[PDB]
Write a protein that binds this ligand. Structure first.
Ligand SMILES: OC[C@H]1O[C@H](OC[C@H]2O[C@H](O)[C@H](O)[C@@H](O)[C@@H]2O)[C@H](O)[C@@H](O)[C@H]1O
Ligand SMILES: OC[C@H]1O[C@H](OC[C@H]2O[C@H](O)[C@H](O)[C@@H](O)[C@@H]2O)[C@H](O)[C@@H](O)[C@H]1O
Ligand SMILES: OC[C@H]1O[C@H](OC[C@H]2O[C@H](O)[C@H](O)[C@@H](O)[C@@H]2O)[C@H](O)[C@@H](O)[C@H]1O
Lengths: 721, 721, 246, 228
């Protein structure tokens, strides 16, 4: 049984197979247990209260109670706890608060912060409401913890109210914290770089502080808002994992602190860097939603828990179980150099090979002949498009293709009519030159006039044109913060920018819910759960190399479902890596994600066209298995591995893709075992007609055979009889 | 369904959850699968046949079939396979054989080599009999594989027949081999040293050859006949483990060879060192029994599989589930300096504290006043014992105590009547001085006159005296091999010694089956599964230090059940380590094994006596849980750990012992989680009366609290309600 | 091939002797011929590196290090083959693409530079090459004539080792006033800072003129600061830095 | 200064920057030091002689001297040392030998086994000749250690003579052995495969035995006769 329970001084937050048990101890909240379900909790794992030197006390005479040594669910500075704080508020001459628990309530159903992406489908949830007060400062802090009945996840966020007669300023306000008992731990994170997104990093927890953070005003290519605290020795198949994640696309921090006693704190939230928040009397602040997810089935277990929760409670219901169209995108195919004739030629060829959707990328608006101008001028270039956009769209519809369009709303070029009319709309500092990035500037979405203008322009574009799909890019990070009327307002503008973004995108996604929106940021520059609340797929990476893609897809689907993960077959030599790969391998790698194409189909041989049509035919069959099915990593592509293998199960269908990076000689063939089959099941392998029991495939596995050569791949397809 | 099946060219050997599937390929036997059960095996994991350079072929025209590259179940040298061989026979001018499969049979029930310890309780087994022949050499090799219906174990051994007209000579004949597919593996072994027995070693499998072996004529203190080939990343709780073990107490070898292609061979058997075996026409040779055991539940899983199989099919039925008596042994207590008065005083005190059995150790026979003489003179020293042995025994019986006696049958002192009468009975080389060890020599048990004499002397001792328990020591290794009439007979004498031992001990254990026999070899010098077929417990180590014992008991119960593992509370400062430990800790450590006492109870304070009586009271209660119950390692004592914790479950009883080696300060208390409880079960902790659900104990665990100081311990006792 | 089916003795003991006697017979044979024809350069071989040991190298002053003539597969092979044995012994030939063992295309520049870390030869059908490939080979031959003493007679310093985890290989040779460094990268990388490659065993105060840019660097700079190693996009690229001490 | 020196019961084999110092202890040869040059060696790193359980003795009354525990330069089986042996000879009904040191000589210049490849340019070398005998078996074992003045290398090999009236059979005869003191070590070897020759392998030394070997009648693609 699940939901929230209040029993004497214990609070139980109970999701499926995951409990958070909190004790009220004279106004202080103690984390008693976070993990597998325990009813009638007694306190076997209670902290032993002793005098720890230099760990101080709320009263003079009791040296054994210290907030330096108690496990907690939020952190303050200045009351004796010296671990990193997660709430810190300036008021009067101090930034000491002392929030004490005063009252708990339980809500049922939908619940979340205003103006920030939060879980949906909440009919079967309950929320613990822990109301804390600092009576001297006259502030309220309210903590929310939400159960899910169908997932091992709890969601959290807080609300800070200013009930005093003066302005106060928030300096730190994380969305989730947990004090875990001394033990050996490892952490997994997703880091990497542009064209290397979501690189899986694993390391030992060491004394001191480890963090990942973004100060770029987007979550960034190089860090994802995720941190997995794992049992020492965790594998794909076994061990305890706790994943903490943030539904936020701005500046964030995740940290792990191992303190002097070997205790471990973890927390995630809005980055303290580039953040302060002014509250006038009666005003309040709500933090983004954090998630804590648990598995005892290792890294595959946490992948599955995380993917499920995202699919059911974050990704838009309209798309979360909807097969996504196989597209063509002209970007790598033509860059900015195209016109109506080329587009329709490309469309004709896409149609021949059975592609479903045609995406017109950058270069259709203003005078956007290169990447040095025109951002901000969302006006159709009718000369380039050889007529109205309406006219191009009908042309595309008549050819049997859905129609998609690229936007980059959050940006403005110096050389643009927009910048000529409103230079003050750029993020900038009075009396400092611009910092440039891809020769463009960032619109100040903290300015409500900017948001209203973008709502208006885009509403107009989407209502007046039959567009089936939007690709929403964002191609630089935020510099030169100085648009406030005061320092505090500038310190607010990065979070306000985010609120403006979320207002903009929630409005458009809602008022045009039939359109499939794909998020983008030079590929994977902002691929987080904040964006995925509104954009059910994401351009995972500008790196379209089949081999470079292996670690990228490993990371990109680690916590997020495969359905979200854009992947396109592109030309050779590849434009990022300078590499020749087999067209078969580019096909098979892209088919481990959400398939599209991004090369000039008009310039391909008859043979290459035929191959692509065969791939499109294959994926139409494989699409439900890949997009709707359960993913199992069999061999991980990392720094030391020469291989990648991923399996998908979906009812009676089981597919396995295998790739080898470098050619090898006088090396015994890999044995590749499948996962999660019926031992007694009978599995017929498509290529040889042979029937194998699930036991054989799982316990003996496949001898994987390849010719000589680099970047070869193969796929095994199984039907359960 | 389990047993043996022959289906076309496949042989299935099916134990509970473990299958060996063998293919006959034109007379060559191929290992197709060893692992979890597979029915209707098709060959997903078949070796891919290609031309491997320098891997040669039985025929001229087929370069793709090579015994260098096929996975096999026995190894020959000279047919193109260059991996280490496990059968090698000299005949005529060569030691090339080419054994080819000719015929298979299936046996039911009891089956094993003559004169060597083998499994019992075999009603529900079936044996695959694979009959091979070298027609040119006129030799037969017969392989046996036995299923068990109640254990994930298969047993093997072979028989070599000389069907030719000339003498032939066996050079290598292992008991089990397996070729495993290229993959990442680790190996676990039990090594260590005298007073450091069975140290658990874990390492990576690397190209080349790793081995453990004994050339000491006993298995030895420093290596156990065991080798666990593990899945990379195996833990206590998860991963595949294959344990290969040998039922043999002589010279053995276990090896792992990773060859040029990354393939891995493992094998166990009689050491080739110090071994050759002459076969006259019509003569045959049978190897000792090897075992292969499997788990997919990690190292605890393989501990359990191995312990179960030993308990049910190796250890004598008479004792395998019988609570063992709590004993006193006078060895550390008095050494050689004792007499009737001292013995009965010790007995009185043992009785007061509730000890059940009194063991008279070394020094009662011949003129054994020190360790420099008298071995071989098994004559009661009636002066020292103050009358007949019969008289001492009645005295001990009348005091309520069972009676036990120390023997060392396999040894002879230079200064002894035996040596004076028969100097040629010693293992020795004509014209070389003796090599001495503890100033004693080894009897040549390959001489049938030696065996007949020891049968006679000991039968006489056991029939004429009411002895309840024997402790059978063996205190040196074998040097100076030279008693043969030819070189070949000397090369035979180490295995013949073993056959003589097994003849001797099987005879006595059988003809006196009411007596509990404890094996010994300066503690753990010969603690293997050969000895444990006859001796249901073993003096695990001369190291009776409570702390030094931690890693020793870890190793000693790794594959063998706790019931076998002798452990005695001894005096402080400890005689081996020079260390003071709490009497509580010596008690609790010894109670993780088969409890006895070995200190001068007459010299203890009133307080220490009281404590011992309380420990004896406690263990009477804990004995079934420890000796009959299921063992779970919670914290392993190794080189880097400051801790040890072991749990035992037995029906409604759950106990956990925790020891800390070094005192620590400003270090958070350990959280200790229990295993294998009912989540919903209610567990009442004896010390505080508190009731905890199994979920809490398993998922939250116990905060472990201790004072300041070294070598402290505690025990938590739980009753399931 | 390797030796199977031991059974030529008149007794078991003589068969047990025949493998060592085989060796004694080999050594008698090869010492005789190498001695009676000492002007001839003998190269030992055994499907490449099947018998590359110090017994053979007493008589055969070079050895075909490997049948694998792939430029990239050669990296770990040359690492091992010159680990204890001098570079002069280590046969290495520029071969055709796609490579016959690995099935791989590599730049002719890389096949040249990898083979020039050993004892250079060629092993491809020169009659079937383009005019351009011929020209390149003539340039490589010209280069190696210059580099030969440095490589064969000079002192070798491993700077980056090609192993299972490394994406790189770099080897330096010093010979009097000459210092060369070869660098190879196996897989193309993106958004990865350039490697810093430091040289070894120079004079701190020495002045080293880099051939490609004419710049003069003190030995201290080359050893303690090192070279930013720059490459285009692509797999199996290589470069060589050549230094003259002034 | 380099070459060979005999000073009381110590033998010094001195190459450039590498010394092998051997002690004759009542016929038994002990490895005292192998490493950087030491003159006037005293024995700071001598084995401490104690009773090790199950390590046996040449005489009845001295439990502290054992060939199981002494560091040596050649290994026999059956005299109490249980480490892998490097000389093992069958004669009569046994393969127990007990070779004892009887005499040392020093050679200068060219020197090597007949019919096997050996060092050249040996003008500036000296060879320690350690003559051992098993008087019961009537066998001689002679160990040679050669200095080089221009290299930190010592070369070794042995000669076994049958001085008895019967056929004898050599079962093991390695060319070099060394007992090194307990410490943490790693080993490097060159292994690999055809088309992957001489793959550098590095690993930790662990309790038990590690080996590389060829049984192919050639040294082989997959292992080189080297161990670091
Ligand atoms: O401009 C359209 C383009 O926008 C995003 O990529 C931006 C990157 O494109 C090129 O790779 C360029 O070389 C890079 O420097 C630049 O960051 C988007 O992710 C692309 O899909 C495409 O739409
Ligand atoms: O002699 C009886 C004794 O025998 C075995 O132990 C032999 C060891 O005893 C002492 O520890 C001695 O110091 C050691 O050198 C010697 O090896 C047996 O294991 C002991 O229980 C005891 O019976
Ligand atoms: O036959 C001449 C050839 O001999 C040696 O190589 C033998 C190998 O040649 C091919 O690679 C063949 O495919 C292999 O199977 C065979 O082992 C020598 O090393 C070569 O240089 C060449 O002379």
């Amino acid at each position: 049984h699940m939901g929230v329970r209040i029993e004497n001084n214990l609070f139980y937050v109970e999701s499926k197979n995951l409990s958070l048990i909190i004790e009220n101890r004279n106004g202080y909240l103690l984390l008693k247990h976070l993990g597998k379900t325990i009813k009638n909790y007694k306190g076997s794992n209670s902290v032993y209260e002793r005098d720890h030197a230099f760990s101080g006390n709320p009263t003079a005479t009791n040296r054994t109670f210290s907030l330096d040594t108690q496990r907690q669910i939020f952190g303050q500075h200045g009351l004796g706890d010296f671990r990193k704080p997660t709430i810190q508020v300036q008021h009067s001459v101090t930034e000491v608060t002392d929030f004490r628990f005063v009252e708990a309530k339980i809500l049922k159903g939908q619940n979340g912060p205003q103006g920030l992406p939060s879980p949906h489908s909440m009919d079967d949830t309950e929320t613990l409401v822990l109301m804390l007060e600092d009576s001297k400062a006259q502030l309220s802090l309210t903590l929310y913890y939400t159960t899910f009945n169908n997932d091992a996840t709890i969601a959290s966020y807080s609300k800070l109210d200013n009930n005093s007669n003066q302005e106060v300023v928030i300096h730190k306000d994380f969305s989730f914290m947990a004090d875990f008992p001394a033990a050996d731990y490892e952490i997994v994170t997703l880091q990497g770089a542009y064209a290397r997104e979501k690189t899986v990093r694993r390391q030992q927890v060491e004394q001191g502080i480890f963090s990942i953070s973004s100060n770029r005003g987007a979550s960034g290519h190089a860090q994802t808002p995720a941190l997995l605290l794992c049992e020492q020795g965790v594998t794909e198949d076994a061990g305890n994992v706790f994943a903490i994640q943030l539904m936020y696309s701005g500046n964030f921090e995740a940290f792990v602190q191992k303190n002097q006693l070997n205790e471990v704190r973890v927390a995630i939230g809005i980055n303290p860097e580039n953040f302060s928040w002014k509250l006038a009397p009666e005003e309040y602040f709500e933090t983004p939603v954090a998630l804590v997810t648990h598995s005892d089935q290792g890294l595959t277990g946490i992948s599955h828990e995380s993917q499920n929760f995202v699919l059911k409670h974050i990704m838009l219901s309209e798309f979360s179980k909807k097969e996504r169209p196989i597209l063509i995108n002209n970007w790598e195919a033509t860059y900015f150099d195209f016109q109506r004739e080329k587009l329709l030629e490309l469309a004709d060829e896409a149609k021949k090979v059975g592609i479903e959707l045609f995406v017109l990328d950058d270069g259709w608006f203003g005078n956007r002949f290169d990447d040095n101008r025109a951002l901000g001028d969302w006006v159709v270039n009718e000369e380039k498009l050889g007529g109205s956009l309406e006219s191009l769209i009908s042309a595309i519809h008549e050819r049997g293709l859905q129609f998609g369009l690229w936007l980059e709303p959050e940006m403005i070029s110096v050389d643009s009519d927009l910048y000529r009319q409103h230079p003050d709309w750029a993020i900038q500092v009075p009396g400092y030159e611009h910092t440039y990035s891809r020769n463009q500037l960032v619109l100040n979405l903290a300015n409500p006039q900017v948001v209203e203008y973008l709502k208006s322009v885009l509403d107009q574009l989407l209502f007046y044109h039959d567009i089936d799909y939007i690709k929403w890019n964002m191609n630089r990070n935020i510099t030169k913060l100085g648009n406030g009327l005061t320092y505090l307002e500038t310190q607010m503008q990065s979070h306000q920018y985010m609120l403006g973004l979320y207002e903009l995108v929630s409005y458009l996604t809602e008022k045009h819910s039939h359109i499939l929106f794909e998020s983008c940021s030079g590929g994977g520059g902002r691929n987080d759960l904040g964006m995925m609340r509104y954009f059910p797929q994401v351009w995972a990476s500008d790196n379209t190399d089949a081999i470079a893609r292996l670690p990228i897809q490993y990371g990109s689907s680690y916590l997020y479902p495969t359905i979200s993960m854009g992947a396109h077959v592109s030309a050779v030599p590849n434009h990022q890596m300078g590499r020749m790969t087999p067209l078969e391998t580019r096909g098979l790698v892209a088919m481990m994600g959400n398939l599209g194409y991004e090369l000039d189909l008009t310039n391909l041989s008859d043979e290459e066209k035929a191959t692509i049509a065969n791939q499109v035919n294959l994926y139409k069959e494989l699409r439900p298995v890949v997009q709707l099915g359960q993913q199992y990593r069999l061999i991980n592509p990392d720094t030391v591995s020469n291989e990648a293998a991923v399996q998908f199960n979906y009812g009676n269908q089981t597919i396995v893709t295998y790739v080898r990076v470098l050619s090898v000689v006088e090396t015994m063939e890999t044995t590749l075992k499948l996962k999660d089959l019926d031992e007694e099941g009978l599995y017929k392998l498509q290529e040889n007609g042979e029937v194998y029991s699930g036991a054989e495939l799982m316990y003996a596995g496949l001898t994987v055979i390849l010719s000589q050569g680099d970047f070869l791949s193969r796929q095994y397809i199984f039907r359960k009889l």
